Amino acid sequence: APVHVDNPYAGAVQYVNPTWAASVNAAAGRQSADPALAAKMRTVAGQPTAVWMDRISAITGNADGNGLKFHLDNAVAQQKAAGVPLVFNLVIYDLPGRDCFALASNGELPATDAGLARYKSEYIDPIADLLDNPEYESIRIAATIEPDSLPNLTTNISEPACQQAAPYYRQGVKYALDKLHAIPNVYNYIDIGHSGWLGWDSNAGPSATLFAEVAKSTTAGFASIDGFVSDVANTTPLEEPLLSDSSLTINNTPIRSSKFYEWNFDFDEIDYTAHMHRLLVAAGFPSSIGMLVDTSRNGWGGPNRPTSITASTDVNAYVDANRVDRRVHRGAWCNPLGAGIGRFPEATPSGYAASHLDAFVWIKPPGESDGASTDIPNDQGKRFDRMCDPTFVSPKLNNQLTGATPNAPLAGQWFEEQFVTLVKNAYPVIGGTTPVEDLVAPT
């Protein structure tokens, strides 16, 4: 009933998930021997993260969460206490043939008509039925729409699983957008990958065109999509502070031709969001579209972060000494070693006008694994993806090891060592929070 706004984050607070906060606080308690680190973890626990509907069972509740209604009810209470609008971040993530480029069957719904019928009736419909309840008119929902989906159709269509998934990604995203856009307090942010996947002109361009086709297939057209979100569950840095000029040439050799960048001009997500905003508008979207970056794990801080330019005559040595992204390769999506927490969630961050940023958000919740690092038997029926395997030399990474973090649990499970590293390596640094009872000398 309230009017639908251009940017639901402006002047708003964001939902804080008490279940994830409790997981963070438990991790902090396990750092009793390192009280300064525990204090930083306590600060992290106060930050807003998205709630993932990563399977049908998450709607009513499962071993990983208490159900969607629990969060919506919590969000209305948090909005009342804030006295300003509140955005509840929700991830829509269950397409038939999900994650078609993974060499594994990662999605619970197969890429078949039966899978699509279940996506519509047992996944989207119950979510929309809850979101449309008049009980929730007092909150805003920012729905991140299907990470790791549509751009596979323009970059990874050589994989048969992506060919099979293609009609279901198009029809499933259309259905999600149609059902969710009909709810006036829902704001749809289409996932746009990240610069290490789509920054090349040959990938960015066709992706923007495909997003416009999807928009035009919906009943409301371009109005169905409020904005776009990059870097979800990835680690590509917000900015490369030392490599700020991707056109720099050293002795007639472009630094973008380095092994790490593979001729891509987009070294970071600020540049990528500016690039995609341009292309999306040119493809038919209104200039009012806004962008989000998932800053949950893209900080690349800690002692390994370069602090000044190391001089070199060789483009690879120059890039490798000066990049803050310390991954083996920008395609390393599964628990890459050394990642740190990035900027805290924030409405309308300043200083990046061309990126048209509605907010920085934590879509992936820091501490949750991207996937298991070995083929562990499990009561989720989840399957093993070698991109999470520290032993795997991946063709997707120019024949290099994944650099994945070992001893990783299933996706969504708490990853103890990874969270320690994420907090230690945060950029900006994290300040500590100390409860009042711990300010007195213990007696």
Author numbering: 1 to 443
Paper text:
High hydrolytic activity of CBHs against crystalline cellulose is achieved by the unique structure of the catalytic domain (CD), which consists of tunnel-shaped substrate-binding sites covered by loops. The unique function of CBH is a unidirectional movement on cellulose surface coupled with processive hydrolysis of the cellulose chain into cellobiose, the minimum repeating unit. In contrast, GH6 CBH from the bacterium C. fimi (CfCel6B) has CBM2-CBD and three fibronectin type 3 domains (FN3s) as a linker between CD and CBD.
We solved a crystal structure of CfCel6B CD with 1.3 Å resolution, to clarify the structural difference between CfCel6B and TrCel6A CDs. In the determined crystal structure of CfCel6B CD, we confirmed that the Val43, which is close to the N terminus of CfCel6B (without signal peptide) and mutated to Cys in the single-molecule fluorescence imaging, was located in the opposite side of the catalytic site. Overall structure of CfCel6B CD was similar to that of the TrCel6A CD except for the additional subsite and loops. Near the product-binding site, a pair of exit loops has been also found in CfCel6B and TfCel6B. This exit loop 1 of CfCel6B is 4 amino acids shorter than that of TfCel6B, indicating that the tunnel of CfCel6B is more open than that of TfCel6B. In addition, the exit loop 2 (shown in cyan) of CfCel6B showed more open conformations compared with that of TfCel6B.
